[PDB]
């Protein structure tokens with residue numbers, strides 16, 4: 001059935017980002033609980049219908065590694081995207097309560113991300129464009145899913161006008177120009193894993209003594225770091241050599257030398273995590289409360 | 291009297307920016323029309339009261355060059371700032387309808403900005419922090435006023451997390467570090483004048499043949515331009531030498547060599563515009579429709 005504005009009832013607020021709020025809502029006719037994302041945009045009636053028309057491809061996105069989609073519509077200067085509600089939140093929320101995410105678990109996250117990026121590329125011919133912890137959602141039945149990928153050419157456009165002014169997960173090639181594509185997503189995933197592995201955004205890298213301690217930067221300064229300085233590493237010693245090398249392979253500045261989806265899929269760290277009997281479900285509740 | 295949420299009625303939307311919507315509203319008990327800015331923030335009950343308490347100094351800001359303030363309060367995860375409604379909008383809106391703002395008029399804008407920055411510094415000991423066309427508001431009775439300056443230390447904090455991802459009006463010293471202060475505002479004003487003088491954001495500078503034509507950039511690319519490349523100039527010929535030199539004085543990369551408020555106040559371009567009988571009121575309506 002068709003989703004429309006009067007059929008919803010607000011339950012609570014799941015969070016906000018740039019120009020978009022996300023509500024936990026009830027779809028009154030179906031009884032279903034959904035997450036409803038609202039994007040406020042000053043756009044003509046014609047292009048909005050393009051946006052909505054381009055958003056319909058989400059109905060064709062069906063993967064255990066991709067957040068479920070219910071439908072998209074336009075309401076009060078708002079574009080609504082209605083998704084499956086992930087009771088576990090995003091991994092940045094999870095990191096905030098957990099402090100640091102264990103390697104074995106990052107192993108599972110990494111598999112879900114690679115499998116999701118692969119799905120989008122193979123079946124839909126698109127890159128993600130916004131891989132970061134907050135766009136990796138998890139739930140109580142143990143599933144790990146990507147959200148907030150760019151399906152709509154026109155929506156990518158009307159949203160060009162702003163980005164997160166502190167942390168960037170953008171690849172050095174994307175920070176410098178047009179010359180980027182899918183390899184860019186590898187960089188963001190790599191950076192996200194380091195953040196989650198370590199307990200904080202990894203640029204600038206942890207101080208010599210700040211390292212065995214665990215175990216405010218300016219806009220240009222930060223970006224100039226990503227572009228011109230050696231990429232972040234996992235600290236030597238407390239992570240397996242295979243993990244260290246996997247993120248090393250992800251964080252290579254040159255996008256052609258950097259590893260791609262098909263090489264990471266057969267990487268030692270994945271082969272290994274793919275074998276492991278890990279109770280992701282049980283871990284997520286033990287750490288957050290479900 | 292005290293402003294509160296149920297005493298308001300929405301009239302229309304004046305616009306939006308980062309995390310903040312602005313409504314044209316009616317204050318039902320007084321009958322007054324106001325602009326009401328809402329800032330949505332995930333913040334504890336204690337710091338919010340600090341924010342509100344810090345916002346009260348706006349009651350003490352009374353200058354014909356500073357947008358009027360009615361009051362500030364907290365409502366539904368929203369911080370409300372209620373201001374005088376400026377029926378002329380901001381100068382970016384004005385530029386959009388006008389295409390290009392005449393020199394004589396920029397003369398008046400420049401005087402209003404300098405006089406407003408001076409007021410804030412002399413009487414309140416604060417810098418603006420966000421000088422740009424959209425924070426210069428104008429009205430039908432011909433007044434030119436600054437808005438959106440940082441009065442609240444704590445609010446500056448909870449708002450650190452995002453900035454405009456395309457155009458920056460930030461000074462090179464502010465893009466590179468903590469080492470900035472009031473001189474930074476001079477840079478932004480300078481850049482704003484060039485934009486308004488010329489009809490578009492002046493970085494990168496107009497192409498050789500794109501110049502007598504009038505008469506898509508990446509994040510790092512743009513910032514790297516502001517920091518490492520020569521500052522934008524007005525085109526030679528169609529602006530007075532005095533204007534060209536005034537913005538030159540504003541756009542000096544070194545903040546100590548750059549001109550300050552007291553030097554610009556006695557600059558040839560100001561001395562001259564200060565004499566001129568300019569019908570700003572009449573111009574603003576002739577161009578926008580009042």
Ligand SMILES: Nc1ncnc2c1ncn2[C@@H]1O[C@H](COP(=O)(O)OP(=O)(O)O)[C@@H](O)[C@H]1O
Pocket residue numbers: 014015016017018020021022035067083084085086087089090093134135137147148
């Ligand atoms: N489908 C969902 N289920 C549960 N929580 C969600 C969902 N989508 C978004 N959220 C939460 O709402 C927050 C706001 O998301 P968004 O507007 O996409 O901002 P961000 O830039 O943080 O991704 C996200 O950080 C996430 O915590």
Ligand SMILES: Nc1ncnc2c1ncn2[C@@H]1O[C@H](COP(=O)(O)OP(=O)(O)O)[C@@H](O)[C@H]1O
Pocket residue numbers: 304305306307308310311312325357373374375376377379380383424425427437438
């Ligand atoms: N007091 C006001 N009177 C009339 N219009 C206003 C007022 N304040 C803001 N606006 C309009 O609302 C828009 C949204 O403003 P804001 O949230 O401060 O975003 P910006 O970053 O564009 O300044 C502004 O661009 C301006 O056009």
Ligand SMILES: CC(=O)c1cc(C(=O)NOCCO)c(Nc2ccc(I)cc2F)n1C
Pocket residue numbers: 017018019020037055058066067068069081083146147148149150151152153155156
């Ligand atoms: C570009 C495009 O197609 C697009 C961009 C975004 C997005 O949510 N960006 O978030 C920024 C918040 O600050 C988006 N949303 C989106 C995409 C897939 C799914 I499953 C859920 C979603 F909400 N789309 C479908």
Ligand SMILES: CC(=O)c1cc(C(=O)NOCCO)c(Nc2ccc(I)cc2F)n1C
Pocket residue numbers: 307308309310327345348356357358359371373436437438439440441442443445446
């Ligand atoms: C920091 C601080 O004190 C502060 C920051 C801002 C602000 O509006 N920023 O806008 C960003 C929108 O994207 C703000 N607002 C503000 C300040 C003065 C006046 I007169 C009206 C206002 F709405 N204050 C009072």
Ligand SMILES: [Mg+2]
Pocket residue numbers: 017134135147148
């Ligand atoms: Mg998101």
Ligand SMILES: [Mg+2]
Pocket residue numbers: 307424425437438
């Ligand atoms: Mg503003």
